[PDB]
Scaffold this motif. Structure first.
Motif, PDB file in Angstrom:
ATOM      1  N   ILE A  68       0.857  -1.183   0.000  1.00 12.12           N
ATOM      2  CA  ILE A  68       0.000   0.000   0.000  1.00 12.12           C
ATOM      3  C   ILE A  68       0.894   1.234   0.000  1.00 12.12           C
ATOM      4  N   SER A  69       0.638   2.151  -0.932  1.00 14.75           N
ATOM      5  CA  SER A  69       1.412   3.383  -1.013  1.00 14.75           C
ATOM      6  C   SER A  69       0.839   4.498  -0.147  1.00 14.75           C
ATOM      7  N   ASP A  70      -0.483   4.574  -0.013  1.00 12.48           N
ATOM      8  CA  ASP A  70      -1.096   5.760   0.571  1.00 12.48           C
ATOM      9  C   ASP A  70      -2.413   5.401   1.237  1.00 12.48           C
ATOM     10  N   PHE A 111      -0.651   5.148  -6.627  1.00 11.10           N
ATOM     11  CA  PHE A 111       0.348   5.736  -5.751  1.00 11.10           C
ATOM     12  C   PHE A 111      -0.234   6.681  -4.708  1.00 11.10           C
ATOM     13  N   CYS A 112      -1.305   7.411  -5.024  1.00 12.94           N
ATOM     14  CA  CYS A 112      -1.765   8.468  -4.131  1.00 12.94           C
ATOM     15  C   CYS A 112      -3.282   8.575  -4.194  1.00 12.94           C
ATOM     16  N   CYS A 113      -3.884   9.049  -3.103  1.00  5.72           N
ATOM     17  CA  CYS A 113      -5.338   9.118  -3.044  1.00  5.72           C
ATOM     18  C   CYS A 113      -5.764  10.172  -2.032  1.00  5.72           C
ATOM     19  N   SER A 126      -1.787   7.477 -10.388  1.00  9.90           N
ATOM     20  CA  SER A 126      -1.240   6.139 -10.587  1.00  9.90           C
ATOM     21  C   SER A 126       0.027   6.176 -11.432  1.00  9.90           C
ATOM     22  N   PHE A 127       0.792   5.079 -11.352  1.00 10.18           N
ATOM     23  CA  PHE A 127       1.927   4.886 -12.247  1.00 10.18           C
ATOM     24  C   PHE A 127       1.487   4.776 -13.698  1.00 10.18           C
ATOM     25  N   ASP A 128       0.196   4.533 -13.955  1.00  4.69           N
ATOM     26  CA  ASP A 128      -0.303   4.527 -15.324  1.00  4.69           C
ATOM     27  C   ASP A 128      -0.469   5.931 -15.895  1.00  4.69           C
ATOM     28  N   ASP A 150       4.153  10.666 -16.955  1.00  2.00           N
ATOM     29  CA  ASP A 150       4.961   9.846 -16.059  1.00  2.00           C
ATOM     30  C   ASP A 150       4.103   9.540 -14.838  1.00  2.00           C
ATOM     31  N   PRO A 151       4.565   8.673 -13.932  1.00  2.00           N
ATOM     32  CA  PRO A 151       3.763   8.376 -12.739  1.00  2.00           C
ATOM     33  C   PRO A 151       3.325   9.642 -12.002  1.00  2.00           C
ATOM     34  N   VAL A 152       2.105   9.604 -11.472  1.00  2.00           N
ATOM     35  CA  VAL A 152       1.507  10.722 -10.744  1.00  2.00           C
ATOM     36  C   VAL A 152       1.923  10.627  -9.279  1.00  2.00           C
ATOM     37  N   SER A 153       2.615  11.658  -8.779  1.00  2.00           N
ATOM     38  CA  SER A 153       3.186  11.621  -7.433  1.00  2.00           C
ATOM     39  C   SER A 153       2.258  12.157  -6.344  1.00  2.00           C
ATOM     40  N   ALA A 154       1.239  12.950  -6.683  1.00  2.00           N
ATOM     41  CA  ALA A 154       0.340  13.465  -5.651  1.00  2.00           C
ATOM     42  C   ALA A 154      -0.970  13.924  -6.272  1.00  2.00           C
ATOM     43  N   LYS A 234      15.426  11.763  -4.584  1.00  2.00           N
ATOM     44  CA  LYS A 234      15.073  10.424  -5.043  1.00  2.00           C
ATOM     45  C   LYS A 234      13.627  10.042  -4.769  1.00  2.00           C
ATOM     46  N   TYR A 235      13.083  10.406  -3.615  1.00  2.00           N
ATOM     47  CA  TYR A 235      11.790   9.902  -3.178  1.00  2.00           C
ATOM     48  C   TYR A 235      10.731  10.997  -3.186  1.00  2.00           C
ATOM     49  N   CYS A 236       9.479  10.574  -3.310  1.00  2.50           N
ATOM     50  CA  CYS A 236       8.346  11.474  -3.149  1.00  2.50           C
ATOM     51  C   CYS A 236       8.028  11.562  -1.662  1.00  2.50           C
ATOM     52  N   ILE A 237       8.373  12.682  -1.040  1.00  2.00           N
ATOM     53  CA  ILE A 237       8.241  12.855   0.401  1.00  2.00           C
ATOM     54  C   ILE A 237       7.095  13.815   0.684  1.00  2.00           C
ATOM     55  N   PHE A 238       6.215  13.411   1.597  1.00  3.77           N
ATOM     56  CA  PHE A 238       5.112  14.255   2.036  1.00  3.77           C
ATOM     57  C   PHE A 238       5.646  15.494   2.737  1.00  3.77           C
ATOM     58  N   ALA A 239       4.996  16.630   2.494  1.00  5.88           N
ATOM     59  CA  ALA A 239       5.250  17.847   3.248  1.00  5.88           C
ATOM     60  C   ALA A 239       3.920  18.406   3.732  1.00  5.88           C
ATOM     61  N   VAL A 279      12.940   9.593   5.926  1.00  8.59           N
ATOM     62  CA  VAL A 279      11.643   9.971   6.481  1.00  8.59           C
ATOM     63  C   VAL A 279      10.727  10.274   5.299  1.00  8.59           C
ATOM     64  N   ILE A 280       9.940   9.278   4.902  1.00  7.05           N
ATOM     65  CA  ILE A 280       9.149   9.403   3.692  1.00  7.05           C
ATOM     66  C   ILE A 280       7.823  10.097   3.946  1.00  7.05           C
ATOM     67  N   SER A 281       7.354  10.129   5.191  1.00  9.05           N
ATOM     68  CA  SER A 281       6.045  10.721   5.409  1.00  9.05           C
ATOM     69  C   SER A 281       6.029  11.464   6.734  1.00  9.05           C
ATOM     70  N   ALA A 295       9.261   6.245   8.259  1.00  8.96           N
ATOM     71  CA  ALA A 295      10.504   5.990   7.544  1.00  8.96           C
ATOM     72  C   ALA A 295      10.481   4.643   6.821  1.00  8.96           C
ATOM     73  N   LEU A 296      11.471   4.462   5.944  1.00  9.20           N
ATOM     74  CA  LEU A 296      11.546   3.296   5.069  1.00  9.20           C
ATOM     75  C   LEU A 296      12.142   2.086   5.797  1.00  9.20           C
ATOM     76  N   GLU A 297      12.422   1.029   5.023  1.00 13.59           N
ATOM     77  CA  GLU A 297      12.538  -0.329   5.556  1.00 13.59           C
ATOM     78  C   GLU A 297      13.717  -0.552   6.503  1.00 13.59           C
TER      79      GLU A 297
HETATM   80  C1  LIG Z   1      11.526   6.129 -10.964  1.00 13.77           C
HETATM   81  O1  LIG Z   1      10.094   6.031 -10.782  1.00 13.77           O
HETATM   82  C2  LIG Z   1       9.421   6.353  -9.618  1.00 13.77           C
HETATM   83  C3  LIG Z   1       9.977   6.149  -8.352  1.00 13.77           C
HETATM   84  C4  LIG Z   1       9.258   6.493  -7.202  1.00 13.77           C
HETATM   85  C5  LIG Z   1       9.896   6.271  -5.838  1.00 13.77           C
HETATM   86  N1  LIG Z   1       8.880   5.902  -4.830  1.00 13.77           N
HETATM   87  C6  LIG Z   1       8.179   4.598  -4.937  1.00 13.77           C
HETATM   88  C7  LIG Z   1       7.942   3.995  -3.537  1.00 13.77           C
HETATM   89  C8  LIG Z   1       7.287   5.036  -2.629  1.00 13.77           C
HETATM   90  C9  LIG Z   1       7.632   6.385  -2.785  1.00 13.77           C
HETATM   91  C10 LIG Z   1       7.054   7.372  -1.975  1.00 13.77           C
HETATM   92  C11 LIG Z   1       6.121   7.034  -1.008  1.00 13.77           C
HETATM   93  C12 LIG Z   1       5.457   8.093  -0.121  1.00 13.77           C
HETATM   94  N2  LIG Z   1       4.187   8.453  -0.807  1.00 13.77           N
HETATM   95  C13 LIG Z   1       2.911   7.660  -0.767  1.00 13.77           C
HETATM   96  C14 LIG Z   1       1.991   8.431  -1.356  1.00 13.77           C
HETATM   97  N3  LIG Z   1       2.492   9.714  -1.634  1.00 13.77           N
HETATM   98  C15 LIG Z   1       1.728  10.816  -2.230  1.00 13.77           C
HETATM   99  C16 LIG Z   1       3.810   9.809  -1.211  1.00 13.77           C
HETATM  100  N4  LIG Z   1       4.582  10.779  -1.336  1.00 13.77           N
HETATM  101  C17 LIG Z   1       5.768   5.696  -0.867  1.00 13.77           C
HETATM  102  C18 LIG Z   1       6.338   4.690  -1.657  1.00 13.77           C
HETATM  103  C19 LIG Z   1       5.861   3.337  -1.394  1.00 13.77           C
HETATM  104  C20 LIG Z   1       4.823   2.845  -2.191  1.00 13.77           C
HETATM  105  C21 LIG Z   1       4.312   1.569  -1.977  1.00 13.77           C
HETATM  106  C22 LIG Z   1       4.838   0.812  -0.946  1.00 13.77           C
HETATM  107  F1  LIG Z   1       4.339  -0.429  -0.737  1.00 13.77           F
HETATM  108  C23 LIG Z   1       5.862   1.274  -0.127  1.00 13.77           C
HETATM  109  C24 LIG Z   1       6.381   2.549  -0.345  1.00 13.77           C
HETATM  110  C25 LIG Z   1       7.494   3.063   0.544  1.00 13.77           C
HETATM  111  C26 LIG Z   1       8.618   6.771  -3.781  1.00 13.77           C
HETATM  112  O2  LIG Z   1       9.216   7.845  -3.720  1.00 13.77           O
HETATM  113  C27 LIG Z   1       7.983   7.049  -7.334  1.00 13.77           C
HETATM  114  C28 LIG Z   1       7.443   7.244  -8.611  1.00 13.77           C
HETATM  115  O3  LIG Z   1       6.193   7.787  -8.805  1.00 13.77           O
HETATM  116  C29 LIG Z   1       5.388   8.357  -7.751  1.00 13.77           C
HETATM  117  C30 LIG Z   1       8.152   6.901  -9.754  1.00 13.77           C
END
Ligand SMILES: COc1cc(CN2CCc3c(cc(C[n+]4ccn(C)c4N)cc3-c3ccc(F)cc3C)C2=O)cc(OC)c1
Length: 309
Positions: A68-70, A111-113, A126-128, A150-154, A234-239, A279-281, A295-297
Motif C-alpha cells: 500500500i502506497s497511501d 500511488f496516491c489518493c 497512478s503509475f499509469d 509519467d507516474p503521478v506523485s500526488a 530520489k523519493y516522493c516525500i510528504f510535506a 523519512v518518507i512521510s 521511515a523506510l525499511e
Molecule cells: C523512478 O520512478 C518512480 C519512483 C518512485 C519512488 N517511490 C516509490 C515507492 C514510494 C515512494 C514514496 C512514497 C510516499 N508516498 C505515498 C503516497 N504519496 C503521495 C507519497 N509521497 C511511498 C512509496 C511506497 C509505495 C508503496 C509501498 F508499498 C511502499 C512505499 C514506501 C517513492 O518515492 C515514485 C514514482 O512515482 C510516484 C516513480
C-alpha cells in the motif's frame, strides 16, 4: 492589561512515542480529521490504526494483495481510502476494519489518493500516468484524466472540492476542474515529487527532486516562498503546513531527519533526529502541536513528536 500576539521563534518538538508493528517500509501516515487517530500504510500490505495522542496500537486492516502506497481519511473520520500496488484502491470502514469497496480501473500501481471535503468523491493518481475520479457511494470511476506523461506523485482536493492539484515525475504541476475534468492551469522541469493545497486554500506547496520546496500562489502563478536545506533527490516525500501553533512547513528528508521551517522567513527552525532511514512521510495533527513521522525499511517505525507551540 492588554492582549498580546504570541510570536514564537522556534517550536520545540520532542519525541514522545515510537510505534512499531509494520514489517516492511511504512509509506504514509495521516491523522484523522477529528484528531483521534493516526492511520499508517506499509509495503507489508497492511494499514494500521493508532491512537493519535498516545500512539497506542488500535487495529490492523488487511485485504490488499500487494504493498500500500497511501491512505486517506474521509471528513467524518469514519472511512479510509487506500492506494495499492495491486492496481486497486480500497474504501474501508475504520470502525469495523472491513473493506466496503474495491475501486478497479487503474492499469498500474496506484500511488496516491484523497477524499474531497464532502467525501462523496475520491481522487487517485497512478503509475499509469492518469488521475481518476471515483464515486464513493457506488465505487464507480466517474472520470479518467490523461493528466501526465509519467507516474503521478500526488493528488489533492481544494477546500470545496472544486479543484484537484496533481504532480508528476514529468516535471509538471497541474490544476484541474473537478466537475469537468479539464485542465485549468499548468506550472512547468525537474520531477515534481509532491503537491498539496494550503490550509487557507490559496497556495500550493510543491516539492521537486532538486532538494527544494516552493510555496506558490497558483492563481498569480508566482512563487512566494522557497524552503531548502533538506535532502530530497530520489523519493516522493510528504510535506505539510503546520498551523496549530506557529506557522511552519514540515517535511521528511533523505538524511533521516524531519525538517521544520518558518513559513514566512523560510529559515530552518528545527531538525528532528531519531529515524534510521528516509523519512518518507510526515503529518500534522489538526488541532494540537503534534507531528507524526514515518521511515523506510531500515527503520519501519512511526514516531510521534510534541511541541509547546
Ligand atoms: C523512478 O520512478 C518512480 C519512483 C518512485 C519512488 N517511490 C516509490 C515507492 C514510494 C515512494 C514514496 C512514497 C510516499 N508516498 C505515498 C503516497 N504519496 C503521495 C507519497 N509521497 C511511498 C512509496 C511506497 C509505495 C508503496 C509501498 F508499498 C511502499 C512505499 C514506501 C517513492 O518515492 C515514485 C514514482 O512515482 C510516484 C516513480
Amino acid at each position: 492589561a492588554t492582549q498580546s500576539k504570541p510570536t514564537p521563534v522556534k517550536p520545540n518538538y520532542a519525541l514522545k512515542f515510537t510505534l512499531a508493528g509494520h514489517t516492511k517500509a511504512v509509506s504514509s501516515v495521516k491523522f484523522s480529521p477529528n484528531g483521534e487517530w493516526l492511520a499508517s500504510s506499509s509495503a507489508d500490505k497492511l494499514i494500521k490504526i493508532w491512537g493519535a495522542y498516545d500512539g497506542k496500537f488500535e487495529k490492523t486492516i488487511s485485504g490488499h494483495k500487494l504493498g500500500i502506497s497511501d491512505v486517506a481519511w474521509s471528513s467524518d473520520s469514519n472511512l479510509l481510502v487506500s492506494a495499492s500496488d495491486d492496481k486497486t484502491l480500497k474504501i474501508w470502514d475504520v470502525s469495523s476494519g472491513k473493506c466496503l469497496k474495491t475501486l478497479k480501473g487503474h492499469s498500474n500501481y496506484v500511488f496516491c489518493c484523497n477524499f474531497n471535503p464532502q467525501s462523496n468523491l475520491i481522487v487517485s493518481g497512478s503509475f499509469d500516468e492518469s488521475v481518476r475520479i471515483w464515486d464513493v457511494k457506488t465505487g464507480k470511476c466517474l472520470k479518467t484524466l490523461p493528466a501526465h506523461s509519467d507516474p503521478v506523485s500526488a493528488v489533492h482536493f481544494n477546500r470545496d472540492g472544486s479543484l484537484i492539484v496533481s504532480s508528476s515525475y514529468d516535471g509538471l504541476c497541474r490544476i484541474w476542474d473537478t466537475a469537468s475534468g479539464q485542465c485549468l492551469k499548468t506550472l512547468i522541469n525537474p520531477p515534481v515529487s509532491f503537491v498539496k493545497f494550503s490550509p487557507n486554500g490559496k497556495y500550493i506547496l510543491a516539492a521537486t527532486l532538486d532538494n527544494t520546496l516552493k510555496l506558490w500562489d497558483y492563481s498569480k502563478g508566482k512563487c512566494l516562498k522557497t524552503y531548502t536545506g533538506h535532502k530530497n533527490e530520489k523519493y516522493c516525500i510528504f510535506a505539510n503546513f503546520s498551523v496549530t501553533g506557529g506557522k511552519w512547513i514540515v517535511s521528511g528528508s533523505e538524511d533521516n531527519l524531519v525538517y521544520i521551517w518558518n513559513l514566512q522567513t523560510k529559515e530552518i527552525v528545527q531538525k528532528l533526529q531519531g529515524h534510521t532511514d528516509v523519512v518518507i512521510s510526515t503529518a500534522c495533527h489538526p488541532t494540537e502541536n503534534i507531528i507524526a513521522s514515518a521511515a523506510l525499511e531500515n527503520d519501519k517505525t512511526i514516531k510521534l513528536w510534541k511541541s509547546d507551540c
